[PDB]
Amino acid sequence: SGSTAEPDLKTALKAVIPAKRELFKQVKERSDEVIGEVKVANVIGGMRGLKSMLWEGSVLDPEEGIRFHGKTIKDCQKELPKGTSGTEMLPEAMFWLLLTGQVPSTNQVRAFSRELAEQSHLPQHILDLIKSFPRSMHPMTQLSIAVAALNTESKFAKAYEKGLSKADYWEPTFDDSISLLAKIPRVAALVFRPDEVDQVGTQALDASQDWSYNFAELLGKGGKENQDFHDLLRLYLALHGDHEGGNVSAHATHLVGSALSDPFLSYSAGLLGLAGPLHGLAAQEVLRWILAMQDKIGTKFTDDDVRNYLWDTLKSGRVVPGYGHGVLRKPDPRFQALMDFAATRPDVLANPVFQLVKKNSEIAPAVLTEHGKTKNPHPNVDAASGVLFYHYGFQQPLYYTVTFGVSRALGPLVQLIWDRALGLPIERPKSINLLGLKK
Amino acid sequence: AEPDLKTALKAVIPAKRELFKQVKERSDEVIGEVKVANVIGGMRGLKSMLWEGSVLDPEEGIRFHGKTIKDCQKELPKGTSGTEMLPEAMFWLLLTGQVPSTNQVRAFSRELAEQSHLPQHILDLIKSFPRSMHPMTQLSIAVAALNTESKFAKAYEKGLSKADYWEPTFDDSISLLAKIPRVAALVFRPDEVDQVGTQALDASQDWSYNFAELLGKGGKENQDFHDLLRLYLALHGDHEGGNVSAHATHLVGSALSDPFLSYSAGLLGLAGPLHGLAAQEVLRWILAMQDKIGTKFTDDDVRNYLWDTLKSGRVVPGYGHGVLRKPDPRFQALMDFAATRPDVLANPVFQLVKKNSEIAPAVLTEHGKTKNPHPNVDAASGVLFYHYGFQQPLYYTVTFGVSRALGPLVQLIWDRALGLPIERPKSINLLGLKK
């Protein structure tokens, strides 16, 4: 008899592809319109400030923070479906929104969550590969490699090799994207649990549960005793999914993808960028810094004690980690979302490590402004994420970037699908040497 | 002994920092405009990044510190046998802006041979790959895995002054260059990993010679191939900053990911059909054409295969370019290499490549989409490898991977010597462009 089921994700995307192609055609008619200037600063300064790439699902306002299809984080928290338990927005609902431009129904998200659970299994060769990693290989190196290795499972790579019309690129791109999303929490958990590859690598995920819940189970933090952690993980993964196109991981994914490398190879390149100290490692560094501060001033500390430690940091020529940003000039709404997560949880508010993060957030911006060397003295999301993981017993900060890697698949994979749906060309700017800028 | 490479680089760091200061004083000078086309069209034509060692002229092709390919062929040192320029001599030039002496290149070649051994875990990793794993996926992964050996990663973690970032970056770059031909050979020789993985290189021979030996084409009987390999590896080393592999390397490196992780990202981009994988795709396409049109065929048979490819919504591989608007001097250099070798000219697969080069530009012009109907270097490279016995085109881009470490690693060293920041452009959505 007849389906009761609402459109699935691929069907929902199909519904909106023609309109985006039409908008693209209209913009293309204005190809020759001048929208800005290039200065020497832009070339030597890593393209900072230069509007030079397309990204559909999110736009970062320097004053107001990230928007997803023009919606605030608070809007998304209110409107996006939640899990069968808990109160935080689901990252798979965020993926739906980023891709389609629409808020899915709870029933649509339930069906998508089932697909992600079902598609999470791995080839035996991937488990063999992971078992070959030395114990001391950095977790982000492990994650990047294992994601690239999954290109053995790429429908796009195989279809292209057999002969694929340009018009038919988006669908295998979509298929590979969902495959990767389904698999990456398991890969991440394998990086976290090298002594349990055979179990973690094969265990069936509960297809009635959400992506974050099942990630937490694979991490060994399943069960009702970890329900607050499940909600933290949902929120964290949703908040870190996309931050417009110019951030290193998103951009690298787009760049590699633009040569028609498949989504596995493309997001591997994004992960290699996340492995960079100036891009993915800050949340780890923040927690190390806070804990080092705590060791010095104690669990009972004054505002002056914190000010003094901040001044010593700056006088020493070092940055206060988790403060400032390449684009944001004002408080990061992702930071406030994570602090507000703590607001309803007395155990978190009582945690001296959280209290130190909180107090630092109240003191550091004035100190940084007085010191005068930053363009943005405000906290960014990395100021808060680590301590919340730490509170819930995820206390090995080397793996905080691995969780970032899982989240940050979301937005860049959405854009790769659109890149292919629209037929965007290879990304290939022109370079110049210093001699050419001199004369 | 004459100055070694690190010493020669140290000598030229001050002048570059001084030039950089001078350019920075002109930070506010407008040098161009951004158009809608640049945003939607993959930054095409937008002068938006620094690259010191080479600059690609749309009409004339690549220059390395203002020298042509022909200039380099004349001026760069050669091996102990053969007549083609050494890629390690090209690396020296790219890095320092100076032509090394033959004695300096000899010493550098010896360093590359000495530094080529691999940790056991890399051999173990490669042995885990299934036979179905594409060779470029293998290569990308194995290079990332070598970050276990990164001096930069370790020194950064420990405490390193910004002014000194370049030194461990240089050390890691040389380590990677020394090791990557062996990694590539392990991709080519999956049943011989334990042997190929540990065999000592000839310490008196050049980088390309030793790569050829690891590939199983060592010795005097393979001297022609050694010269092909030298030329090929030198020609593919750098193509200014905006090509996908170079750019991805710079981009990932700008977050202070070490050279192993950064060039892994470059390789992943090189693995793309529209970038380095075109070398593979050209010969797959040529061989498919050969199978269809036969041993004896007309110009119409070739035209028809071209047009059928286009009508199918597929590209003609090895034709066109993002910047070049004229014949690629790297393509010409390879065809000139073939021109003096009667055995190559007689090879029917080479003849088909050549005949195609005489027809495809007209067909691409008829079709009317490309901005450049001329061949690029990928049109010719794979057939030369085929001639010399490398007959599995799925491996072709692996050799490109070895070559293309050269230029991007040079720029990472300079990026760190100069203190260049993270690459972080601003994006916009179509709705924002519609306003």
Ligand SMILES: CCSCCNC(=O)CCNC(=O)[C@H](O)C(C)(C)COP(=O)(O)OP(=O)(O)OC[C@H]1O[C@@H](n2cnc3c(N)ncnc32)[C@H](O)[C@@H]1O
């Ligand atoms: C040393 C490694 S670089 C290995 C090089 N890659 C290849 O050899 C593969 C084929 N070449 C291309 O795909 C392309 O020539 C590049 C190189 C990616 C340059 O890309 P663009 O700068 O976007 O090219 P533009 O001419 O402005 O594009 C205009 C329209 O014409 C078509 N268009 C352009 N060229 C072709 C072509 N060869 N066949 C069919 N359509 C084409 C394109 O698909 C497009 O709609």
Ligand SMILES: O=C([O-])CC(=O)C(=O)O
């Ligand atoms: O936006 C950026 O440049 C950095 C980034 O990924 C983030 O803040 O999540």
Ligand SMILES: O=C([O-])CC(=O)C(=O)O
């Ligand atoms: O320059 C480009 O964009 C592609 C190319 O020929 C290369 O990287 O060798």
Ligand code: NA
């Ligand atoms: Na085994």
Ligand code: NA
């Ligand atoms: Na036309």
Ligand code: NA
């Ligand atoms: Na035209």
